[PDB]
From a paper:
To investigate the structural basis for specificity in the Bacteroides PNGase enzymes from group 2, we solved the crystal structure for B035DRAFT_03341PNGase to 1.95 Å. The structure consists of two domains: the catalytic domain and an NBL domain, which are linked through a flexible α-helical linker. The catalytic domain consists of two eight-stranded anti-parallel β-sheets, which is a consistent structural feature of PNGase enzymes described so far. The active site residues that are key for activity in EMTypeII are conserved in B035DRAFT_03341PNGase, with G388 occupying a critical position to allow the accommodation of α1,3-fucose. The available space for this fucose is particularly apparent in comparison to PNGaseF/EMTypeI. In contrast, the α1,6-fucose points away from the active site, so is not an issue in terms of blocking activity, consistent with the biochemical data. The NBL domain in the B. massiliensis structure has a very similar fold to the one in EMTypeII and is unique to these two proteins. They consist of 11 β-sheets connected by short α-helical regions and disordered loops. In contrast, the B. massiliensis PNGase from group 2 (B035DRAFT_03341PNGase) showed good activity toward plant-type N-glycans on HRP, with negligible activity against other structures. Overall these data show that B035DRAFT_03341PNGase requires a core α1,3-fucose for optimal activity (i.e., plant N-glycans), but that the presence of an α1,6-fucose can be accommodated (activity against insect N-glycans).
Numbering used by the authors:
A (entry chain A): 25 to 68, 84 to 570
B (entry chain B): 27 to 69, 85 to 570
Write the structure that this text describes.
């Protein structure tokens, strides 16, 4: 390849850069067009158009973007040649002799190969520093490589800098603006009150309005979600603080599918109006999906700290309390329940007249091609209607939870999205004692495992009103059956294998601990089928 | 009771407590004379007493700490604070006003007589009426009530001789509360970095040594002789001193109950027995009859550049100044008694690296036997910076270990910490894979290690790379870990085991390499029995 001779007397060059990670060539490539002292760099539900430029005469490097809304933004960085660089030897690339310069940036070692063999300057990565030459290679940590694969002449001279810089920003504001540009954010609740105030669901529910229900401790809203959630990852974000309640409470975010005759809306209006799980104990309404009722789909199980923000005046040497707690979970596998117009709910079970303030948003982040699969709710024993007289799910003492479900088509590699916490807040109750959960499908044992968290001392600063014991521990510090005050309880993804069309049975056995002093143990388990 | 205490110069009230019907053991004796009240419990432990001065209108907490220290705290009160009338009642023949108040969520009613000229209460902190409190009712359910009232024919003075050291209430409570707590400081903002450090030949007690290329710090520490009747927590605090990345962290102890230990491996990797994979030999990862693998106490991951990169601006974020990690390790008690080598690892290649603190805490607990905890395996790459291979053998082999028990074991468990690694799109850091555990050739459990809450800890991650789709590296779901957080152990139930030989294996369908990118798994297991 006779590179120097081919681009002697060219009016400009086009360099194509490819990137590789430890040998493996990554997709997509950068075209760097050089003409005089100007450089343009380009690649090759609406995305910003992103470009980079350099002016070697004025010595500024530029980020540039046209946002979906057609606002132009840019950020300009002046540079000096060779800033932060230490000579680090010689090499050859595409037959051209290169100085190599080394710099380190945020712990990375970066080597920049650059030639003076041909009369053109440019670099694909100005942000690591700009050598006075044409950059043929950038090596990060010996492994991550962006290298010129080709250099070709341009016959015509050409101005490359854009028409406008539009709105000039510093680099951090620019990067944040472009990064968030393709993100859909659906605000749902913003510091909304959840409290016990006997509130009841109206007989008219309009779109976009918060309603309070199950005695105040459920808030519901019908929200317009993207039509399709394909090619997105989806996260739930909650922010909470106490507005008066001192205690660690059971929190849940859920959606209410209405694809059958009855939905959890019908249960919120009137618990006894929907089908029941029929335990040896008695009948427990609203907990299992059936042919004509869907249980609510849980998105996130969380537990409040003891009196966040509200009790920050408590003094405990060594502790510095937080002003609020956040919770963020990926819920991408529930995408099919998170498209179109959807009833969304949040729950914090409590008895306080002022209670808690909770925020909730959904974020949809652009992702590689990602099919929406299906998610079908099977069961949910969270006591969402505790403040409207729902029984505690105490039937595990003598019974398994049992469901039936039907598939129209076979499903490969099905999974149960399974949220479990144990409850019974004394020394022999299931909050504080390890118990297995055993899942059965179509008469076979799928898995037996113990739900347990032993990291709860980590979140001490989220718990200003946690009781301090005479042995030195705080209530919030204790290990518990799969939850910690102030944190998310993460789902288990239980592999079910391939399921044939037709009906199936599934059950959950938990050796729940016996009552004591009138107090009961109980389990809050939810399960959605992912297929 | 009236009748009997006309012209008494004082009274003794015995208070019993009850919970949901059930009368609690042992009781409170309240001595009242004049305007003074002394409270003591009716027969290691600090001595606790409470006083009231109705003349000065203060209530007092008082204690003698085991080590002969007297502390006290004074809280002025006003009569009837928080209190609203809630009617009439009778207790042991005396006419009571009932007052109501609420405190930190709770309902409290307080029955109090003026029928006899004595004032006192066993619970001044719920409020002090201008009479004698016969009954305190907290959420209808928590009850302290007078069982006996006895006259004193003579006056006494009841406040204590010394107040010792006078504190605010919160400083009092913290002081008494931490009285029985043993805290062993281990490391204090100690550097963990890559500086080619090597383990010395002379190793004294109570000193910090650097090893495995600088990324291991070790100390031999004097732990309680017995950890019976304690719950035990490990507390770590970390920040970057230069390293921008999310690193694998581990706190471990080195048992030396057998011929060779992990200390021999730290000094020289190839000096200890190996796991023999199809692939190759992997030293130090499995216990044998002459070698114990290190016992992991806690698996954690650092944020991306805590403290050091806090100058990074990301709208809506407010960075933490350090990250703490606290785990309960009570079931490893047997490895946390006597003289013990403790280590911390943060695998990194940085010249300055990290700073890490570590303490153990032993909190008094109800009767609790020390059980046993035997290490079986540990594939954390503790010696990464001294040339240890990545545990990549899962691609074609299971991890297998054999062990022998001398006696039957009831309700055995595997204390199992797993994380998956391989930090690209097709690597096991970011793809769900089962771990299947086998005992004596039978499947115990198959389960998917996964964390999908990592977005929660964004503020612990100032140097996390921000992608063009709006997510940050630290936000992504991963195989059982999040940058800035603890990975919690699985407790896998193995059942009763017979004395004699057993095998355990772990199968993981590890992803295939892509060029020089390899997936690998860091798994550790200690038998609890």
């Amino acid at each position: 390849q006779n590179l120097q001779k081919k681009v002697k007397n060219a009016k400009g060059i086009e360099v194509i850069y490819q990137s590789s990670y430890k040998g493996k060539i990554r997709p997509g490539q950068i075209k760097m067009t050089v003409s005089g002292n100007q450089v343009a760099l380009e690649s090759v539900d609406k995305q910003p158009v992103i470009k980079n430029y350099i002016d070697y005469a004025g010595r500024e490097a530029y980020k540039w973007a046209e946002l979906p809304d057609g606002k132009i933004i840019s950020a300009a960085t002046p540079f000096e040649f060779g800033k932060g660089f230490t000579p680090a030897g010689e090499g050859k690339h595409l037959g051209l002799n290169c100085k190599i310069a080394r710099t380190s940036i945020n712990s990375n070692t970066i080597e920049v190969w650059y030639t003076h063999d041909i009369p053109f300057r440019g670099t694909p990565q100005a942000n690591v520093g700009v050598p006075d030459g044409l950059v043929l290679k950038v090596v990060r940590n010996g492994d991550m490589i962006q290298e010129a694969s080709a250099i070709t002449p341009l016959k015509k001279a050409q101005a490359l800098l854009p028409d406008s810089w539009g709105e000039k920003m510093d680099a951090a504001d620019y990067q944040y603006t472009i990064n968030q540009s393709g993100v859909i954010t659906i605000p749902v609740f913003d510091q909304q009150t959840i409290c016990f105030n006997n509130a009841k669901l109206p007989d008219t529910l309009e779109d976009g309005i918060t309603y309070s229900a199950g005695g105040g401790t459920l808030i519901l809203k019908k929200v317009k979600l993207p039509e399709s959630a394909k090619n997105r990852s989806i996260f739930v974000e909650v922010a909470q603080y106490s507005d008066g309640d001192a205690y660690d409470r059971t929190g849940s975010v859920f959606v209410i599918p209405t694809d059958k005759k009855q939905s959890f809306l019908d249960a919120i209006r009137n618990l006894k109006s929907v089908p029941s799980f029929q335990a040896k104990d008695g009948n427990y309404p609203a907990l299992i999906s059936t042919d004509d009722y869907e249980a609510p789909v849980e998105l996130m199980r969380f537990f409040t700290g003891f009196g966040v923000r509200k009790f920050n005046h408590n003094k405990v040497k060594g502790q510095h309390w937080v002003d609020s707690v956040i919770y963020k979970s990926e819920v991408t596998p529930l995408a099919s329940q998170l498209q179109g117009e959807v009833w969304i709910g949040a729950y914090i079970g409590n008895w306080d007249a002022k209670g808690h303030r909770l925020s909730l948003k959904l974020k949809y982040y652009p992702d590689d091609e990602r099919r929406v699969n299906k998610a079908m709710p099977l069961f949910n024993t969270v006591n969402y209607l505790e403040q409207a007289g729902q029984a505690y799910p105490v039937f595990f003492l003598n019974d398994s939870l049992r469901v039936r479900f039907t598939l129209k088509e076979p499903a490969k590699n099905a999974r149960l999205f399974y949220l479990t916490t144990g409850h019974g807040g004394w020394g022999n109750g299931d909050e504080f004692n390890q118990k297995p959960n055993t899942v059965y499908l179509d008469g076979k044992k799928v898995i037996s495992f113990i739900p347990w968290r032993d990291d709860c001392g980590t979140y001490r600063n989220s718990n200003p009103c946690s009781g301090n014991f005479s042995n030195g521990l705080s209530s919030s510090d204790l290990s518990r059956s799969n939850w910690c005050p102030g944190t998310v309880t993460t789902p288990e993804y239980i592999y079910l294998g391939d399921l044939e069309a037709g009906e199936h049975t599934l059950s959950v056995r938990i050796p729940q601990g016996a009552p004591e002093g009138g107090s009961n143990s109980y389990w809050c388990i939810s399960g959605t089928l992912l297929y």
